[PDB]
Write a protein that binds this ligand. Structure first.
Ligand SMILES: NC(=O)c1ccc[n+]([C@@H]2O[C@H](COP(=O)([O-])OP(=O)(O)OC[C@H]3O[C@@H](n4cnc5c(N)ncnc54)[C@H](OP(=O)(O)O)[C@@H]3O)[C@@H](O)[C@H]2O)c1
Ligand SMILES: NC(=O)c1ccc[n+]([C@@H]2O[C@H](COP(=O)([O-])OP(=O)(O)OC[C@H]3O[C@@H](n4cnc5c(N)ncnc54)[C@H](OP(=O)(O)O)[C@@H]3O)[C@@H](O)[C@H]2O)c1
Ligand SMILES: NC(=O)c1ccc[n+]([C@@H]2O[C@H](COP(=O)([O-])OP(=O)(O)OC[C@H]3O[C@@H](n4cnc5c(N)ncnc54)[C@H](OP(=O)(O)O)[C@@H]3O)[C@@H](O)[C@H]2O)c1
Ligand SMILES: NC(=O)c1ccc[n+]([C@@H]2O[C@H](COP(=O)([O-])OP(=O)(O)OC[C@H]3O[C@@H](n4cnc5c(N)ncnc54)[C@H](OP(=O)(O)O)[C@@H]3O)[C@@H](O)[C@H]2O)c1
Lengths: 249, 249, 249, 249
């Protein structure tokens, strides 16, 4: 029943939405889970909700010293990593005209830079035969109004799964990108200015998607679990689109 | 523990290699499995190996009347289909110069035509919310010497998963393509002329593949299971490469 | 001024739409053009419109003996081929449910089978350093209602350009796929039942396309010219989307 | 004969390799060309080699004020821009383990950040109906050892062509990515430590490429010309692989 029995997993962006739903599923499948994020309140709540086999770690992935501290804790508590889900990321809508340097840096620091260092500093603790999952996005293959940096960053993240497949093959570490479409999580709500707008952005995505609905966080976690588990043992360097068909038709 | 409990599945090409390994895994996960193929001896042996919850059906997918008969049996015995794995297919190496009309028809009849009618005639029995998996190939995105028709046919198969995602969305039926790389199955042995050559074709593919090895049939089955199961509930119309990174780097 | 000066070109599907516009542009660029098709009236009109350096040849690409005859004529008149544009193809809308064997064979015979033999029988006459262009379609990467066989066939055509890039590299022959989106040609009109419907199918495609308009045949020809010319001398095995951004965003 | 007659074009990275070969070809086709780069010596030499209708501008794309100055000059001298070729970029080889923050910022500043602001600040001067060409790379779809940031940056650049296809469609400005493979330019020599190594890195790429050779800068320029010209008037948001078939087979 337990497809991740006694495996140790680290999930950045674990106190919310996709990160948290995956943490739950992971624990359900008998893993020990480190959830990682900046907000202490939410971390504590997420850990409470998860219930068992979980450690909350406060860290900002754009801060190298926070990562070092993270992996020290990981090392003390469990000693090695079987599954790394480099999932923390963020979107701010700006069109080409509106792009400032600060906006650019905010996007690329958390989505690309933070992720690069998240994976680099996990390397000493990563088990041979382990599995790294990167959270790209359908944005990374689409041309969406005012998504200039987000989309570019996530296209960067998909590339890294290809490169790290070659760089880590010697250790039999599998690296795969998951690209979600519309998933019912705080990232949608936190970008609109009004709760009215959010009802409409969701109905818009549903119309565009063959399966006629936004995805549930549970469903992204299940896709990530596949990549985390032995089931994907011959799956390497891919972009797994979990978007109800959005980019496929 | 049982991710396909009481679900009814039909697998063309089920007496051998990938089809059979999937049948096993399916039954292990509590499904009832129809295995389908031409050779009666092997069908009976496969059913024996599988052991429980299995029905062998003799059918040639290029023969419409065989398909009608298949689905009559399916209907009588179980009534409906939750998972269809349209997997039967075959390869014959010929270069552009060498291509005869007979060769062309042999490839396209089993790989494309047979498959089309396999799925068409399953539609009445297919459950709403069900899952169809088509077996494409890495050939469908590569330019491999003397693979002219095979590769084209399998690229045709990947396309059908996109089209049928749109045509079946109303019934919430998910259709996905699985594209295997080198997998340790009879299809490799049955195309060479000598047992010596086969040792070398396997070592060649291993060198080309980041994971440094041919895949085990068990591993393709696990990938197919993902697509068959609820875990992929928000995965539609995709090409899942199970090739150890071959086409990804 | 003349980018195809004294080069000999063969264009199947040359009496209409894309084939003809390319023939014009080719002759404008100083090529000698064979146009090829079934309808004698239209062939003669097309040759008239083109004006100079053109030979019309009646042939059905699904008939091997018509191809042999074609290449006999080609050989007698000009002796060799610098540019082959395997362009003849046809669409009939039918959903999965509606698919008959006759429909299937009609689509695959002209779009895939005919094309394969078109290119195979050109090989003896094809110049080293020559250029073959296959006409795929945006359909080959999309999931369009009732396009089941068309789309699959054109996805097959794209594959062949990859395979033939490998098989013909020894002779330095470049093979590339051109995939058009909506282009203002008879293929749109000939599939609807009413002239009213055609006004609406065109306005629908325009809305879906970033450039906000259907393409002019002149524009597909220019894209084909690029692939035919020395400009694309380091371009091999590609899918050149001429669709105003349809499949790219 | 003159495909870019009286059109004004701006080429970042124009004193060297691809930038310069494209500048030459552009002028040959009757354009007026701004070449842009950091090194004053080379700029002056490039302008000398080009001969006519050229203005050299010293600018560092990572420096906003340099760009502002560049576009002031452009505006005073020629007023508007018909063709922007955002081409400046740079590679430094480092594996995941080896990645420092400085290395990361060097790559992403020139390859991604600089390019974003290059295109943003051209917008006021860009003509309706104009053409923007971004230089991605085959690296953006491959997993190459120690190409971690380069490949991710270039994958970011391809994304930008998608997003800007949508954002600029209103003004009928076409944005396309060109992704070169191995091209015979200083970027190959400037990354090795020894002139011996460079003979071997070139023979390695030649073996991997169907056309059996590295590309000439002249050949990338011809491909860029196609994108710059009216020939590609219905080609938007694409990735044009100019790699002799490297990524296509
Ligand atoms: N949901 C969708 O439909 C969708 C679609 C496309 C892509 N995605 C991708 O999914 C990922 C997140 O999934 P989501 O939608 O669940 O987003 P979400 O609901 O907003 O969750 C994002 C998580 O990332 C964390 N985070 C942000 N910056 C961080 C930093 N510097 N250090 C550590 N943690 C950081 C947040 O934790 P703190 O708040 O505590 O920092 C939060 O827990 C993002 O990469 C996003 O691009 C989601
Ligand atoms: N393993 C790899 O390296 C690889 C690579 C690329 C693609 N693939 C694809 O994976 C799929 C499965 O292959 P496999 O590993 O199971 O190898 P296989 O056993 O050699 O392939 C044939 C399987 O389907 C059955 N079959 C063939 N034609 C049929 C027809 N007309 N009607 C009914 N059944 C038919 C075969 O035997 P019966 O005649 O007894 O039914 C057998 O069960 C194939 O479609 C293949 O193209 C495999
Ligand atoms: N323009 C678009 O919207 C669009 C979109 C996607 C793909 N395409 C592709 O573009 C290509 C040309 O389409 P089009 O716009 O030119 O359509 P069209 O105006 O209908 O012309 C199709 C051409 O193919 C020829 N043809 C058909 N069957 C043939 C056979 N057995 N032997 C020889 N010639 C045959 C026709 O000549 P006869 O009738 O005299 O034989 C005709 O000249 C096709 O391959 C099509 O699939 C076009
Ligand atoms: N040739 C290939 O095999 C290949 C393969 C993949 C991609 N590419 C891409 O093709 C593009 C052109 O490369 P190339 O072959 O011509 O190589 P190159 O000879 O190194 O040229 C790179 C150009 O970028 C300019 N540049 C670099 N940093 C800059 C900055 N901060 N500000 C302004 N200009 C800057 C350089 O001028 P200064 O240094 O004088 O400023 C130089 O002219 C590059 O982006 C490269 O990524 C080439």
């Amino acid at each position: 029943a337990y497809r991740l029995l006694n495996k140790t997993a680290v999930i950045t962006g674990g106190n919310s939405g996709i990160g948290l739903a995956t943490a739950k599923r992971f624990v359900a499948e008998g893993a020990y889970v480190f959830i990682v994020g900046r907000r202490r309140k939410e971390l504590e709540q997420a850990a409470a909700e998860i219930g068992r086999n979980v450690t909350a770690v406060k860290a900002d992935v754009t801060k190298l010293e926070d990562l070092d501290r993270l992996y020290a804790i990981v090392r003390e508590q469990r000693g090695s990593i079987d599954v790394l889900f480099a999932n923390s990321g963020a979107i701010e809508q700006k069109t080409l005209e509106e792009i400032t340097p600060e906006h650019y840096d905010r996007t690329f620091d958390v989505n690309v830079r933070g992720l690069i260092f998240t994976v680099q500093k996990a390397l000493p603790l990563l088990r041979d035969g382990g599995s790294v999952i990167l959270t790209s996005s359908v944005a990374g293959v689409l041309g969406l109004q005012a998504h200039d940096t987000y989309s570019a960053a996530k296209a960067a993240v998909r590339s890294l799964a290809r490169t790290w497949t070659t760089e880590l093959k010697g250790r039999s570490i599998r690296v795969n990108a998951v690209s979600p479409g519309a998933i019912d999580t705080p990232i949608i709500e936190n970008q609109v200015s009004t709760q009215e707008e959010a009802d409409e952005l969701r109905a818009k995505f549903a119309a565009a998607t063959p399966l006629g609905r936004v995805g549930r966080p549970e469903e992204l976690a299940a896709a990530v679990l596949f990549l985390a588990s032995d089931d994907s043992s011959y799956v390497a360097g891919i972009e797994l689109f979990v978007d109800g068909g959005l980019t496929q038709v």
